[PDB]
């Protein structure tokens, strides 16, 4: 029998307004045979830290690797302090106490190493985490909320594993210049595990969390997904579709409908990227099996699911220019490796900016991901975003053209701990593809 899909747990405050979070580890097994693997609050993966909007938490973060690493709020708008990119240094069994003061709508975040040089390979060894936002608007919505039954975390991963069972990750030429990938999929650490779904609607909350692999998601019989939010929350209203592309780091949350007898895969379908559509992923790939049951189920597909506020008008904007490159070896923006000591620009505070983003010079994919906002697509790799792409993102496709972002920071992020932009190809970040950038000013 196919293993039942693993379900994170969903991790709430203490009676101290605290959670914490155990950096550690152990081993898992794949196909019978195991391998060191690294999580929070476990051997693989990590819980669901649910938040509320508007209060206040505090995380404690226990570092039991024998290795340094960072804990990045993947999609949370906080202020570079507590954003825990390649300066937010946790050390061996060290411990790092971080206040989230959430103050954005409800969505689908997620957590991940942001070590300088080896996000990709952290990741890889089995470091991720969500983040449950809500609010007050979307528990009003009657959508699926029965967290493991028909409200479920659906974390997508490939990996490359050694003969010896353990998980192989060496960034040489070849992974820096296309990505780390491999020939096993895993749904939440699972490998093609089932989900026994209540007939009705069941909601699925899809995290591409690969390190350089875009998915595809689509039913084994055609059925269409009901996109309901992306990366920074609801949509106006759902969108439907056929097929729903993630890039590396991007969430959406789709309904998708559960009829009693046919059970049914969520696969993924083969891409046109550079190592991904090499086999087993030649062909539409099992992602997950739906297998319908007969208990409770908690929800609809609501007609309309919230607001999206109009795209304000651009004139006297600050524009940015960031030119994504491939020297070789050498990942750049804007004909430079990453810097950790040396911001790029300092960004305004409370501003909407236009920052647009060239992958023109290389035809490889860049998910470009930014830093301590979500933002709105103006323009995505040429054309303006597919409706269901048009909403909340902290992810815009560049590949091979050129991507313009309406963005906007609320938190200062000063030199010491600055705000990231960098392509989500973890690769190509941990080779020099990022920059860092100040928001705000700051005195000490
Ligand atoms: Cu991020
Ligand atoms: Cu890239």
């Known amino acids: 029998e196919r293993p ?20 550690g580890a152990g081993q898992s097994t794949f196909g019978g045979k195991t391998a060191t693997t690294w999580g929070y609050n476990g051997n693989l993966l990590g819980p669901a830290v649910k938040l509320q909007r508007g209060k206040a938490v505090t995380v404690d973060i ?104 353990q998980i192989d990750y060496q960034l040489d030429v070849m992974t820096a210049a296309v990505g780390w990938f491999g020939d096993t999929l895993l749904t939440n650490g699972a490998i093609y595990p089932q989900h026994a779904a209540p007939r009705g609607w069941l909601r699925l909350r899809l995290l591409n969390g690969c390190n350089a692999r875009s998915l595809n998601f689509a039913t084994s019989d055609n059925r269409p997904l009901y996109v309901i939010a992306s990366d920074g929350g609801l949509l106006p209203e759902p969108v439907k579709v056929s097929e729903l592309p993630v890039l590396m780091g991007e969430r959406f949350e789709v309904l998708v409908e559960v009829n009693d007898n046919k059970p049914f895969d969520l696969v993924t379908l083969p891409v046109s990227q550079m190592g991904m559509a090499i086999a087993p992923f030649d062909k539409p790939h099992p992602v997950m099996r739906i297998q319908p049951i007969a208990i409770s189920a908690s929800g609809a597909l609501p007609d309309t699911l919230s607001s999206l506020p109009a795209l ?7 524009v940015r220019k960031l030119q994504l490159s491939m020297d070789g070896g050498a990942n750049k923006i804007n004909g430079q490796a990453f810097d ?47 409706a269901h792409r048009a909403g909340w993102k902290d992810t815009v496709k560049v590949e091979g053209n050129v991507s313009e972002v309406l963005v906007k920071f609320n938190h200062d992020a000063p030199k010491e701990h600055a705000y990231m932009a960098h392509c989500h190809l973890l690769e190509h970040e941990d080779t020099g593809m990022m920059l860092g950038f100040t928001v705000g000013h700051h005195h000490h």
């Open 340 to 386: 950790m000591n040396k911001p790029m620009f300092a960004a305004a505070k409370g501003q909407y900016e236009r920052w647009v983003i060239s992958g023109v010079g290389d035809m490889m994919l860049h998910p470009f991901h930014i830093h301590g906002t979500q933002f709105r697509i103006l323009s995505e790799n040429g054309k303006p975003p597919a």
């Open 312 to 318: 304000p008008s651009l004139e006297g904007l600050t």
């Open 62 to 165: 226990y570092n039991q690797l024998t290795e340094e690493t960072t804990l990045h709020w993947h999609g949370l708008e906080v202020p570079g302090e507590v954003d825990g990119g390649p300066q937010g240094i946790i050390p061996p069994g060290g411990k790092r106490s971080v206040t989230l003061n959430v103050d954005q709508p409800a969505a689908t975040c997620w957590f991940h190493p942001h070590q300088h040089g080896k996000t990709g390979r952290q990741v890889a060894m089995g470091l991720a985490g969500l983040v449950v936002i809500e609010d007050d608007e979307i528990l009003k919505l009657m959508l699926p909320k029965q967290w493991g039954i028909d409200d479920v975390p659906v974390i997508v991963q490939d990996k490359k594993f050694s003969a010896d069972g």
């Open 4 to 23: 039942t899909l693993p379900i994170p747990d969903l991790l709430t405050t203490d009676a101290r307004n605290r959670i914490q979070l155990t950096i």
